[PDB]
Each structure stands twice: as structure tokens, then as C-alpha cells.
């Protein structure tokens, strides 16, 4: 892991949260060395992400240095495109909507840069419609520098210079997984494809495209700029990089922060700045991920670092990197049943495990928070959690049993006394 | 609830604005032609923009514009959330109750709203235009149990804002489209500075 | 004409046996020796079905509304 840091400094991938948020003149970081990066070959850029080894902070590994070089034909007869996601499907992420708030010019750099690694034609980005005031600034940034002739269709220095178009959904779901957004951009309803056709860079829109996250190509200019042997400075040999974090729940300042790999939760959460609940001597049930990482109690998790394998050394990994706690006021089974209640209103409905299997759990988790009849219902509920992992298509099928099964662990008398109390109430 | 139309307004009718027919040319020029064929997501949204809520004849209007079968229009607007079929009001307001928003005491930004206003839970107003529903997953659970509106967001909601945002909108004001109090930019608050400087020698790209 | 039942003559009218193949199919009809007539077994096409070609760039094999 190194020297357990993961510090917070100015030498990060952010320009400024407070410097200037509107269109500007690209003062320090934006468009510093423009033509010199693309003047080199793609083989200079392919494998340059291997110096970083950015796993992709969407919630899963399989690093971007591999999926862009490998699983990428040169050309057959048909063009290639870029899909840069921007929508946040996980509850309480907030890592997005702040990058576009004050840094609009940083993302436009790695669009042509990351596309040059693929040689794709154009750039299509997808934003939620509900983030409506912030998305208006994005086309203003296109009006700022792209409309100033800095990019496209020959700017600068080479024939490789292209555009960026903005689309919006309404209330969609295809943030949470790929290959539905490439279906929804056609105009179909949003019922995602099977995962191995021909996967997404073989069978796509009409022609094979690539899908990335925000910081999968937002850090791509500066990681191509500062490079190193610096992108692996924190963490072990497995993971590398400095990611944005977000703090919510019960804290003195629920806010974002910047850290890097392999920091333990006792120092990471309580710093910046306050621990307004019982920072110790409370229950402090922590959630490592957005939603797919279940509750971990007050044990050695606070000293367990934020490596991908450290939470794999715990019961559940977390790549979404969201921090919410439940110390004193929160009932354990009350909050998590509302998390299960949430999934009824965003399931697609294709897979017969997913459809009618979630609302199996919906009707029984509302029975436990009420307090109800005799046990061994827990184990039957536990077998259903052991019955939907790899039967569905999307990761929502994995995102439906992991909060449930992690509640079965670590909390045996979460309701073994509560449902007995209702059994004591009727008796 | 039910999702059908038992024939109240089969032909309302509805037409588009002559200012808005030319905007289609920007929309069709985006997609690759031949497989272009369906730009129904911004276009039917723009029909919601002109009308506010759209009838079933408004669905049938755009089907001849983009030569799709009209059944392939009913699939879209009955799936997504922001499209509306029933008649709606002028102000559409949303309580963003989510499970971490529940941890930020959404019960305060729950009722004492219906007692303040005079409406029912999850229900439009009896008079005209206030419609109140609840949504999930719009960014910041790191703020308060915040309030969404038609074109902006109201961060840092509070029972004072319950006595304000309902109150100022009944009067016709615009109650602070953003964080009304506290941190105006949602800053780390003890790390908000982070030594604001030029980013330590750009020009490392020899490599 | 008392109930409407399907009373009948034609004393055989219900005799089906289970044969193994076409080879001993003929050999049983001749061993007792009355007239017959033979159909032929129909097996369908194998056939060529492949998902993935249901999303085209210029072809016609393209599904929608799924």
C-alpha cells in the first residue's frame, strides 16, 4: 500500500472548484500542449494507460488500458464512435454533476484524445435531462472553444479533428449499465441486450463503439501529461490512482473530497472534517459502495484500507466509492428496506429472475420492518439471495442480493428480537 | 394507477410552432441517415415543452413526421418518467426522498408540507397548478433532502424552506435556485482551499 | 336413439401398436397379410439461426420494439 497515503493536495486532476466555473480563456491546465499529444502515434498512447493502470471508477475493474487497445479491431468497413457516460444511476454518488459544474473544458480534451486511441469518428455524450441547469453550461463550453475553431474539422495540426453532440434522456436507467444506452440512443425503449452477443465493441449502434465513464477520459489528458510513476504512487501493486470521494450520511460536513488508494476508513471518513454522530461509541454501520456493498459494522473495517482487494478481503468490494453511515438514529432494517423498495421503480423487466423476483423480496422486507411471525423465513429469504447472481443480465441482479445477503451476515438479532417483540405483542 | 387511454381526447388536436419546425433540421442532421429514423427522445420532449402535457393525438402527430409506426411511440412515453400523459399543473415540484436522504431527516421535508399547503400526499393541488410527487437518484444525497423544480434544483432544504418555498411560490417568487444557505458550492469545508495555485508545473509531457 | 351415445359397429376401430422402425413396419403387415399404405418420416431443417445479425448497418434483418 506504501506509506498509507492517499493525501489531499493541489497536485491532483482538478483545475479548481472555485476558480472559474463558466466559460473561460483556458488559463493554466486547459489546452496547454494541444498538438504535441496527438502528433505522436496511437502506439504512444496505447499502453500509456498501462503506466497508469486506471481500472475505471464506475464500480468495476477491467482497466481502460486493456479494453481500448485489446477488444478493438482496426477497421472492417464501418465507422467507430465514442460513448462517454455522464449519468449517475447509483443512489447518492454526486461524483458527477460537479465536474460539469466548474470544469467544462477538461472533458473536451480527452474526448478527441481518447478517441484517437480508437480512431473513432465522432463523440456522443449522454446526460440526464433532470440535471437541466448544469447541462446548459455544457453547450456553452462548446460555444466557447469548439465554436472558436480550436477543434474540428482539421484543428489542430492534423486531419483528425471532430465534433461532440449532446443528448438527454428523461428518467432512464442506462446509466447503470452499458449496451442499453447504445440501444436507447437509437430510439428503442431501453430493454438492454444480452451481454455476450458479440459484446459492446463488436455489436453496437450500427457499428462497434466504445463506452467509458467520466473520469475514464477526464483524467486521460493529465495522466498523459504528468504521467509517471505518479499514477501509481498510492495503493498496492494492484490498484493505482487518485479518485474523487463523497461523504454523506451523519457527518458534520457532508461534502466531497479528493484522496487516493489504500486509506483506512477510521482516518478517511473522520478527516474532512467532523464525525458529528458518535464517531466512536455508536453503531456506525458503514456502506463502502453506492448500493451494492452491504452494511459492515464497527469492526476492523475502519482500519481496513480502500483497496479493491481490501474490501474483497472484506465481504464485498466497492468501486462506486460512496460513504454513508448509520450510527444511532437510524434503524438498520428500516433504511435497507427502503433501498430494496427503490429497486422496484428502476428494474427493466426483461429477466424472469429479476422481474417478479425483486417483488418477492419487496413484500417480505416490508413484513420484517413491521415485525411479524415466526423465523426460518430468514433462511428462505437467504436462499432467494443465493438464487439470483448470474441468472439475469445486468448487474442489478447482482445489485439486488448483495444488500440482502450482507444483512443476513453481521446482523442475526436485527429482527430476531424485533419480530419476537411483535410475537410478544400479539401474545 | 392505470396506464391506458379510454378515449376522452382522441383528437384534441395539437400543432407545432413554426419556430419549432426548423429546429428539427438540427436534430435530424445529428444522426447517421437511414438508421437515423428515430429522434423521438428530444422531439417528443419538445412537444412536452410546447404543451406541458401531451394528448394521445400529440403522440400520433409526430409518427407521420418521422415515419415510424405509431405503436412505436406508445412504447416510449409510457416508459420514461419525465413524460406526462395526464393533465398537469404549472409548477411540478419533487421531494427527493432517497435512502441517504432519509438519513438526512427527510421526515422534516416530508409533511408539514400538506398541512402548510392544504393538499394530500403524492397529490396535485385541488386548485390549479401545484403538483407534488417524490423522486430518487438525482445526484446529491450529500446535500439536505433537497427539492427539485421545473428548471433548477433547491439545495439545502429545511423546515424554514418548507415555510418559504411553498410560500414564495404561492406569491410567485423564485426561491433561490441552488443552495439557499451554508456552502454555496458544496465545498469540502476544511479542505475547501487545498492550496489554490497553478497546478505545479505543467509541461511534464516529455515522457 | 335413447341418449345420443356414439354406439357403433366397426369392431376393430381402436388398435394402435408401437413399432420400432420402418424396417419391421412392412414385415408386420405382410406376416399377417392385409393391404396397407405407408407415409414418410419428416425431419425439419437444421437450421441456420444466429443472434447478433439482428442489428444491422445496411441489412434488412433488424428487429425493433423488443
Amino acid at each position: 500500500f506504501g506509506s498509507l497515503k492517499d493525501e489531499d493536495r493541489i497536485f491532483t486532476n482538478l483545475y479548481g472548484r472555485h476558480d472559474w466555473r463558466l466559460k473561460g480563456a483556458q488559463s493554466r491546465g486547459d489546452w496547454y500542449k494541444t498538438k504535441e499529444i496527438l502528433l505522436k502515434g496511437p502506439d504512444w498512447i496505447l499502453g500509456e494507460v498501462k503506466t497508469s493502470g486506471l481500472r475505471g471508477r464506475g464500480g468495476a475493474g477491467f482497466p481502460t488500458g486493456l479494453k481500448w487497445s485489446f477488444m478493438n479491431k482496426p477497421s472492417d468497413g464501418r465507422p467507430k464512435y465514442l460513448v462517454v457516460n455522464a449519468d449517475e444511476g447509483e443512489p447518492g454518488t454526486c461524483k458527477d454533476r460537479e465536474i460539469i459544474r466548474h470544469d467544462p473544458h477538461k472533458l473536451v480534451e480527452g474526448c478527441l484524445v481518447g478517441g484517437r486511441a480508437m480512431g473513432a469518428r465522432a463523440a456522443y455524450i449522454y446526460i440526464r435531462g433532470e440535471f437541466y441547469n448544469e447541462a446548459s453550461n455544457l453547450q456553452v463550453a462548446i460555444r466557447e472553444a469548439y465554436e472558436a475553431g480550436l477543434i474540428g474539422k482539421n484543428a489542430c495540426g492534423s486531419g483528425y479533428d471532430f465534433d461532440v453532440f449532446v443528448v438527454r434522456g428523461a428518467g432512464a436507467y442506462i446509466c447503470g449499465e452499458e449496451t442499453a444506452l447504445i440501444e436507447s440512443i437509437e430510439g428503442k425503449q431501453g430493454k438492454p441486450r444480452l451481454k455476450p452477443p458479440f459484446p459492446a465493441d463488436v455489436g453496437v449502434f450500427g457499428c462497434p463503439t466504445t463506452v467509458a465513464n467520466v473520469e475514464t477520459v477526464a483524467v486521460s489528458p493529465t495522466i498523459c501529461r504528468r504521467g509517471g510513476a505518479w499514477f501509481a504512487s498510492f495503493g498496492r501493486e494492484r490498484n493505482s490512482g487518485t479518485k474523487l470521494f463523497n461523504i454523506s450520511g451523519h457527518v458534520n460536513n457532508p461534502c466531497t473530497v479528493e484522496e487516493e488508494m489504500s486509506v483506512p476508513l477510521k482516518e478517511l471518513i473522520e478527516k474532512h472534517a467532523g464525525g458529528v454522530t458518535g464517531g466512536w461509541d455508536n453503531l456506525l454501520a458503514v456502506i463502502p459502495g453506492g448500493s451494492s456493498t452491504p452494511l459492515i459494522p464497527k469492526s476492523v473495517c475502519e482500519t481496513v484500507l480502500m483497496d479493491f482487494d481490501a474490501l474483497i478481503q472484506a465481504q464485498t468490494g466497492l468501486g462506486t466509492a460512496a460513504v454513508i453511515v448509520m450510527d444511532r438514529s437510524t434503524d438498520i432494517v428500516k433504511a435497507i428496506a427502503r433501498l430494496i423498495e427503490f429497486y422496484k421503480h428502476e428494474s427493466c423487466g426483461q429477466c424472469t429472475p429479476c422481474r417478479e423476483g425483486v417483488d418477492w423480496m419487496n413484500k417480505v422486507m416490508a413484513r420484517f420492518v413491521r415485525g411479524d411471525a415466526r423465523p426460518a423465513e430468514i433462511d428462505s429469504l437467504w436462499e432467494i439471495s443465493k438464487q439470483i447472481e448470474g441468472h439475469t443480465i445486468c448487474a442489478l441482479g447482482d445489485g439486488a442480493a448483495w444488500p440482502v445477503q450482507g444483512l443476513i451476515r453481521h446482523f442475526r438479532p436485527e429482527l430476531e428480537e424485533r419480530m419476537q417483540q411483535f410475537a410478544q405483542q400479539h401474545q | 394507477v392505470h396506464r391506458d387511454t379510454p378515449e376522452n381526447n382522441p383528437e384534441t388536436p395539437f400543432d407545432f410552432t413554426p419556430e419549432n419546425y426548423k429546429r428539427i433540421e438540427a436534430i435530424v442532421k445529428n444522426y447517421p441517415e437511414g438508421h437515423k429514423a428515430a429522434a423521438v427522445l428530444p422531439v417528443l420532449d419538445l412537444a412536452q415543452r410546447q404543451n406541458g402535457w401531451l394528448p394521445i393525438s400529440a403522440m400520433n402527430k409526430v409518427a407521420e413526421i418521422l415515419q415510424v409506426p405509431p405503436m412505436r411511440v406508445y412504447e416510449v412515453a409510457t416508459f420514461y418518467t419525465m413524460y406526462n400523459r395526464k393533465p398537469v399543473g404549472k409548477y411540478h415540484i419533487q421531494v427527493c426522498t432517497t435512502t441517504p436522504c432519509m438519513l438526512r431527516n427527510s421526515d422534516s421535508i416530508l409533511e408539514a408540507i400538506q398541512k402548510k399547503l392544504g393538499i394530500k400526499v403524492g397529490e396535485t393541488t385541488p386548485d390549479k397548478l401545484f403538483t407534488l410527487i417524490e423522486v430518487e437518484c438525482l445526484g446529491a444525497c450529500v446535500n439536505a433532502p433537497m427539492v427539485q423544480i421545473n428548471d433548477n434544483y433547491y439545495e439545502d432544504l429545511t423546515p424554514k424552506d418548507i415555510e418559504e418555498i411553498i410560500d414564495e411560490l404561492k406569491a410567485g417568487k423564485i426561491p433561490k435556485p441552488g443552495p439557499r444557505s451554508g456552502r454555496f458550492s458544496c465545498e469540502p469545508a476544511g479542505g475547501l482551499t487545498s492550496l489554490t495555485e497553478p497546478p505545479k508545473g505543467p509541461g511534464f509531457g516529455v515522457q | 336413439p335413447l341418449m345420443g351415445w356414439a354406439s357403433t359397429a366397426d369392431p376393430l376401430s381402436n388398435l394402435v401398436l408401437t413399432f420400432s422402425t420402418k424396417e419391421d413396419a412392412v414385415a408386420f403387415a405382410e406376416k399377417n397379410g392385409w393391404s396397407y399404405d405407408v407415409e414418410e418420416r419428416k425431419v425439419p431443417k437444421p437450421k441456420s439461426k444466429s443472434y447478433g445479425a439482428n442489428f444491422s448497418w445496411n441489412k434488412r434483418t433488424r428487429v425493433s420494439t423488443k
Binding site: 446548459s136 | 442532421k29 419538445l46 428548471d151 | -
Partner: peptide
């Protein structure tokens, strides 16, 4: 923060310059 002025987003600059497109055919 303005509900209208999507023609500023759509028809102002993105209609003046697409560019070009060629967009392929795909007739089908």
C-alpha cells in the same frame, strides 16, 4: 436554469457547424 433556449443549444452552433457529417449509407 432557463427552461427555453435549447435552440441556443441545438440550432445556434450545432446547426451552423455539424461538421460535416458524411454519416454513411445504411440506406438500408
Amino acid at each position: 436554469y432557463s427552461t427555453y433556449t435549447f435552440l441556443d443549444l441545438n440550432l445556434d452552433l450545432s446547426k451552423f457547424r455539424m461538421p460535416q457529417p458524411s454519416s454513411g449509407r445504411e440506406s438500408p
